[PDB]
Write a protein that binds this ligand. Structure first.
Ligand SMILES: Nc1nc2c(ncn2[C@@H]2O[C@H](COP(=O)(O)OP(=O)(O)O)[C@@H](O)[C@H]2O)c(=O)[nH]1
Ligand SMILES: Nc1nc2c(ncn2[C@@H]2O[C@H](COP(=O)(O)OP(=O)(O)O)[C@@H](O)[C@H]2O)c(=O)[nH]1
Ligand SMILES: Nc1nc2c(ncn2[C@@H]2O[C@H](COP(=O)(O)OP(=O)(O)O)[C@@H](O)[C@H]2O)c(=O)[nH]1
Ligand SMILES: CCCCCCCCCCCCCCCC(=O)O
Ligand SMILES: CCCCCCCCCCCCCCCC(=O)O
Ligand SMILES: CCCCCCCCCCCCCCCC(=O)O
Ligand SMILES: CCCCCCCCCCCCCCCC(=O)O
Ligand SMILES: CCCCCCCCCCCCCCCC(=O)O
Ligand SMILES: CCCCCCCCCCCCCCCC(=O)O
Ligand SMILES: CCCCCCCCCCCCCCCC(=O)O
Ligand SMILES: CCCCCCCCCCCCCCCC(=O)O
Ligand SMILES: CCCCCCCCCCCCCCCC(=O)O
Ligand SMILES: CCCCCCCCCCCCCCCC(=O)O
Ligand SMILES: CCCCCCCCCCCCCCCC(=O)O
Ligand SMILES: CCCCCCCCCCCCCCCC(=O)O
Ligand SMILES: CCCCCCCCCCCCCCCC(=O)O
Ligand SMILES: CCCCCCCCCCCCCCCC(=O)O
Ligand SMILES: CCCCCCCCCCCCCCCC(=O)O
Ligand SMILES: [Zn+2]
Ligand SMILES: [Zn+2]
Ligand SMILES: [Zn+2]
Ligand SMILES: [Zn+2]
Ligand SMILES: [Zn+2]
Ligand SMILES: [Zn+2]
Lengths: 559, 559, 559
């Protein structure tokens, strides 16, 4: 608002404790924070801006296998010897995955025509009622025709229009026909980019030996892998997995630092099985798929249908490239700055916990080692300044016999303030730098109030809680309170040019006396504004400074 | 630096307000923060380290369809009945996407030779000038030859060397030939890994029924999906999309908790359309691609070119696997600790806002409900201690007639300090614990200065701003200021063994008197160092304690 | 614990400095923080919830090429003219990558039979010992048979069962046969989804011109790209890369804002080379793969094996879609709130640094510009209150001749407290508001102690460190310390109703005197509890208030 309020700055008040304990603890905690953050910075390279890589994988599988087996075509079974090369056991998959056929079931000479279903999964029909024309299910190799026909002697099945002879349902051959595929080799060419860092690298370095095969120990940087070795590394068996197939994962990790002084961008090759470790009791065990090779002889389309089992090798290339970036370093430092409140939190918790009072009587006798730590009480005394809410029902009373002040914050509701009991607030220590018979009356000098019957509950108070000498007869009472010269001097200190013979001057003196007593018994001003004078002292003060104007008022809210 | 400065610890000074309001508000806000953080922890499982999954998808589509249609080859059109099985309507795509052919346009008997362009997109030529030899465009089915030839009667087009007869440009057949593909079923085998958690699972559980088809309600865990059902789930129509094709997405979500007490790793299957919901008015509507089946009869290469329309089903497998990690829990707790400053911020804002002064005169009459909250002023009085910048131009003046002190921080530049007006700083309350005629002159006792003409602007001051009794004649002035015994006692309190008859002792006494007045009128010491004594009081003090040494000096900078 | 302790609230004590410097610096720093956070919010759109996109890419390549070359089949070499269209130079890859064949080496008429290895990589054998039956290596086109055979005159090689005639090992033809592929065009249909934002868009907009080809400047939104143009954009040469192949990346970026007032969702097309920029000296340079086309003539399976070189174009679609979210805005604001401690940190650092004392004597003479800034000392005086650890070995001593107090916190171990020297703590300023011959003896009035020989080291102290007048003879000593009336008044102020003739009253008076001296010389109470009185003053006090009970005790721990 105002211009003065604009250029103002708040800084917290603090207290510096000269304690070897706190200095030690604070520096230990600060050094622990600093050491941890430096270790994290120089281990996780949090000063480096890290960028993900753009990968490109190109794969080539080399190796040939020979398969000698009996094959049936045109109703004739013959022993055929065949050769499988890259073009024969690989699919033209161009990317991060390649497939090697380890086993196959091929049906040759297929022609679109009518034929019986092969009876492999309960496809047995005894009458045309068991076949629905145009019907199909997932196990159907064709579209059912309404009429049954005999597949062979002593066995009958539904007729279907399909590629015939229909695919016989037979399990994967054991041993795998292309188990020799464990000896095949795959070259993986992996090119990675960090655009932000403007860096490119490949998994193939100049001077590489072509007649190399990866080995984690002897040759961990040759990107030519034997498939059987890939399987042994984990513990898998290629010949067993070859029968029904599987999925293998080739992980190429690039933890690259592009800093010149610390430069290292090399691929780490790891192998995982991404298929279920299936057994003889497993649902959908393996990896198979059907493709067809189409041809035609004698002017009619035909196909060889191959159900291929094999291992699909998915290739997961991942990693990060780090290069020094001052923004990252500065941001990390800024984040870590907050960590250094550890010392303040810990030491302040100790100070507040060891200044709970309960610790002194109970904990110390049980444990004498933690005895002197009660010094924290001193530290809490200087650190904290308790302040009460100033409210109309707040009162303070003091009894000479009593040791301290009573905070009667509870509304009286007609009960005498003498009777009412409240919190026992300690009396503050004086500024020694300067020093250097009503039913509720125990003193006898208390006069009955003059307030309204409801209001007089507050003024019903005695200088002491038990019978004895009145505070009013104390010699110091006249010196401090009733001393006209002292009150006049105080007023002059306040208002040096006030009329000495004013009509209302007496009233002012009375107020001063109220303050004086409230300050003599309730040291703190905050505790002296809300104090309540006993009836005896109040009425002697009134006698010394009476008011002909009318009935004397009473305690009024300070604020 | 020094060893003492090493073991020092700063702890903020604080004030504890005994207020039911603040205790209540503080605990409400703390409980709200705590409840929110606990809810977030136990809902988002922020105590769990979450790891992304490595997925592997293997898909198998089963189902057959029959297509009866007129096909033209070698110039002969014949009604051909054909059967499409998995090997016929699927591409050998091995991964997260599979394609089902829903429609096709096949050109048979193609041979590399010369033939006319089919006139489908304005490929009309009337002379050889309209054809450019060797020319090609994206709509060209061949390489233009320079000479026109007649495609048929009453129509002519450019000659091309291409696969002939050239692909006729005709729109996707309606209805789709393989709309029966809505009845096909796809099995998705999904294997996921969490390496950090060392966990593997598959979307297929033991005891699964093979004769099952996914249903969100009856059977949400069968990984066999009917394609038509996939489309209905969203609202799409397979037969309509079958004509030109599309792209569908199968999302497999894995929200997995690997904690033993709370273990749940199941796939959630959802379906999305990744193609545009195209209509009769849409650019590039659908999904089609051309492949060829190559063969040869009579020792010459030929091909059947198939333009295939269908639905590509991309499969998006994503998810997270969570397992309890104490580091995550501790880090989250550490993050949440900062949230608990809500109470301090709110309550301190209330205290500072309700102690703005402007609130009292203006806001309270309008709203009497927010009347007692002025207690915050008290809380601001104890919390904050305003301190001014000590600067050479800083002065304070007090006038008996005036109620408080004036902070004249503006340089005089020759203007009398009496004339100059400045900020009205309130007079601090005394430590009652101890208590318990120049043109600018209104008093008449002010003597003209003796400073340089420029310097005397500061000393041009009167005890009061209006005519009246001088402060100097006040009885308390002699008691406090001019009282030789009092000043000697103060000096002894300072230096108990100072010479009582020293030559310069008078000067010391004078200084003491300056302090005494500055303390009698400007209570706070910080406000009494920079105070300026009126001419009358200063010159009476000089008269009581004169200096034969020479001309008296004046106010000098405290620091 | 107690109900009173529940409703308590701590608020830090603060001091508001009225400094134009701090107000200015604080507001400058606050405005810098606020401006930075607003700039970041409105640039990075940190008020927007950002969601990653789900992409779908469908690609179509159009263009034809003619290749005239000599081809060998069945032992006959003939000049063959061929045509390559989309079905001929593309693989049926359905996804984010497409392949265009730019070169090829095809071996025709292959039949499974026995044939010699082609001698291309040192496959020279002179006797059957150089061939191992059943042997295979990665360069083997077949399975070795034990017997050598002559490939041709004057050259011999191992026999193999393989597809024969065996693949001749010859390098990629130059120039590329399908270099015309630089003129081919690719249409990329890219459909993106933001599920959270429920937004879908495609890279193709209504009103697009089909006869368009992408251009960064003229036509940056046509998704039809000429491949040669893709290469020129970077700087690559299609005809050179066509020979052996490569990999290109097409990046489609979607920076989309879905806010209605600011709506922009358009694709940004960029091109990168994902292959190594290989040369004549590079390992595994290019991109090639082998596939086969299978057929049969005369009832025997045969194949044409094509080694295809080309460019695989991977398509990387990435981006984020932002929509206004109040949670994001509020969270970002909450994060930024902490940034506004910049002013407090900076100004408090200035205050603490410029109040180091060392700055005054050393820095100021060297630089007079930074002279008045010593005002920070004042600010440190009000801000910080040093407090020492109260410990049994803590003592304070004062010598009239000395200027301040000495903090002797070191255990004496028998050495006289007079001899022991310690820290020079300054004497605090008095509350002027109220003001307004042993060997170690230099005064002569010190009496030898009466403590145990070990304990008397503490009491061995003199009022002054050098010979001179004793403090005890000072007139103020009797007024303050020995004045019986003053001590009685103090005690009455403490206990107004204490017996005036009690047996132990003298002892109380003695204690009061100890306090009085400790307060006269050690102003601060904390520094006066641990003070040590000189022997002379202590023994005069004892003489005035002797104790017949027995030997006088000495300083005891305050707490
Ligand atoms: N602390 C305290 N103050 C009192 C007491 N009685 C009166 N006062 C103060 O005295 C001031 C005036 O009261 P008083 O002079 O007795 O009323 P009057 O006779 O009608 O003028 C009020 O502002 C009260 O705060 C008391 O018992 N304790
Ligand atoms: N606060 C205040 N201090 C003063 C004033 N005049 C003099 N002093 C102080 O008195 C001290 C000495 O001034 P003074 O004795 O009058 O000069 P001298 O006569 O030449 O020795 C200086 O350090 C001033 O701070 C005044 O009007 N106000
Ligand atoms: N600060 C201070 N206090 C003292 C010294 N000597 C005694 N006291 C205090 O006086 C109190 C009682 O000591 P004292 O009366 O001399 O012992 P007594 O004669 O046996 O009763 C103790 O609590 C001490 O703290 C002193 O040299 N310096
Ligand atoms: C959080 C609360 C931690 C309590 C620690 C108790 C430390 C020992 C108490 C000794 C006294 O008090
Ligand atoms: C939610 C936060 C509640 C934690 C309260 C613990 C206070 C313990 C302080 C001990 C004080 C002492 O022993 O003197
Ligand atoms: C958590 C509660 C901590 C209370 C510690 C109290 C120690 C002192 C008393 O007794
Ligand atoms: C770190 C926590 C240490 C707590 C110790 C508490 C001991 C209190 C009593 C003694 O001993
Ligand atoms: C958390 C409480 C830890 C208490 C440790 C106290 C060690 C110092 C005590 C004394 O001094
Ligand atoms: C941020 C500033 C918020 C202001 C809230 C005003 C509260 C009511 C004012 C009452 C008085 O003062
Ligand atoms: C950028 C931050 C600027 C906000 C300033 C608002 C201060 C309002 C305080 C009100 C004080 C009162 O009413 O007593
Ligand atoms: C934002 C500004 C808040 C000002 C509130 C002032 C309330 C008291 C006065 O009037
Ligand atoms: C929570 C904000 C509440 C603001 C209330 C301000 C009321 C001030 C005057 C009364 O009423
Ligand atoms: C932000 C301002 C909120 C003001 C709420 C004040 C409620 C208590 C006031 C009194 O007591
Ligand atoms: C961090 C420590 C920064 C030190 C800055 C020195 C500023 C100039 C010193 C002047 C005096 O003191
Ligand atoms: C790790 C943190 C250690 C940094 C300590 C630097 C303190 C410098 C303060 C200067 C005080 C002055 O000059 O008055
Ligand atoms: C870092 C150290 C900073 C010390 C600055 C000291 C300046 C004042 C003295 O001299
Ligand atoms: C911002 C850092 C500025 C440091 C200046 C230090 C100057 C100290 C002495 C003068 O000049
Ligand atoms: C970090 C130290 C910066 C010192 C700048 C001091 C500028 C104000 C000094 C005076 O006033
Ligand atoms: Zn009484
Ligand atoms: Zn009484
Ligand atoms: Zn005057
Ligand atoms: Zn005057
Ligand atoms: Zn002595
Ligand atoms: Zn002495």
């Amino acid at each position: 608002c105002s211009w003065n309020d604009v250029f103002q700055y708040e800084t917290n008040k603090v207290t510096r404790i000269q304690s070897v304990n706190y200095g030690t603890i604070k520096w230990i905690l600060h050094m622990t924070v600093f050491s941890y953050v430096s270790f994290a910075l120089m281990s996780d390279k949090l000063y480096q801006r890290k960028e993900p890589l753009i990968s490109s994988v190109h794969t080539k599988v080399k190796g040939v296998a020979e398969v000698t087996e009996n094959v049936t075509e045109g109703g004739v079974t013959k022993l055929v010897h065949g050769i499988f090369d890259t073009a024969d056991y690989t699919l033209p998959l161009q990317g991060n995955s390649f497939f090697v056929m380890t086993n196959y079931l091929k049906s040759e000479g297929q022609e679109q025509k009518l034929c019986p279903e092969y009876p492999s999964r309960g496809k047995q029909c005894h009458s045309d009622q068991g076949c629905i024309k145009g019907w199909m299910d997932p196990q159907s190799k064709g579209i059912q025709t309404g009429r049954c026909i005999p597949y062979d002697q002593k066995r009958k099945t539904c007729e279907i229009f399909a590629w015939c002879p229909a695919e016989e349902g037979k399990e994967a051959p054991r041993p795998a026909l292309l188990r020799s595929a464990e000896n095949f080799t795959v070259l993986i060419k992996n090119n990675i980019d960090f655009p932000g860092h403007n860096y490119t690298t490949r998994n193939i370095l100049p001077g590489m030996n072509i007649s190399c095969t990866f080995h984690k120990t002897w040759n961990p940087q040759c990107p030519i892998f034997r498939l059987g070795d890939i399987f042994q590394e984990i513990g898998e068996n290629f010949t067993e997995v070859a029968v029904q197939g599987g999925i293998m994962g080739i992980e190429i990790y690039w933890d690259c630092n592009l800093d010149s002084w610390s430069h290292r961008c090399q691929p780490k090759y790891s192998f995982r099985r991404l298929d279920d470790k299936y057994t003889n009791e497993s649902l959908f065990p393996g990896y198979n798929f059907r493709y067809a090779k189409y041809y035609k002889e004698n002017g009619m389309e035909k196909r060889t249908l191959i159900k291929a089992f094999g291992v699909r090798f998915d290739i997961l290339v991942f990693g990060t490239g780090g290069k020094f970036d001052i923004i990252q370093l500065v941001v990390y430092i800024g984040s870590t700055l907050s960590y250094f409140g550890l010392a303040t939190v810990c030491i302040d918790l100790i100070i507040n916990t060891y200044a709970s009072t309960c610790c002194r009587s109970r904990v110390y006798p049980s444990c004498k080692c933690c005895e002197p730590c009660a010094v924290n009480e001193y530290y809490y005394r200087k650190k904290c300044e308790p302040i009460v809410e100033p409210k109309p029902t707040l009162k303070y009373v003091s009894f000479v016999d009593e040791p301290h002040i009573w905070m009667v914050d509870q509304q009286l509701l007609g009960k005498s303030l003498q009777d009412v009991k409240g919190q026992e607030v300690p009396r503050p220590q004086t500024d020694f730098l300067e020093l250097s018979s009503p039913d509720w009356c125990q003193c006898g000098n208390c006069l009955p109030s003059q307030l309204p019957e409801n209001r007089r509950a507050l003024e019903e108070l005695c200088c002491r809680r038990k019978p004895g000498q009145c505070i009013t007869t104390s010699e110091l009472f006249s010196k401090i309170v009733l001393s006209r010269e002292a009150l006049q001097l105080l007023l002059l200190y306040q208002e040096p040019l006030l009329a000495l013979e004013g009509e209302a001057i007496n009233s002012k003196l009375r107020h001063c006396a109220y303050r004086s007593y409230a300050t003599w018994r309730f040291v703190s001003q905050d505790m002296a504004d809300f104090a309540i004078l006993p009836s005896c002292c109040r009425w002697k003060i009134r006698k010394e400074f009476p008011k002909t104007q009318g009935q004397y008022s009473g305690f009024k809210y300070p604020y």
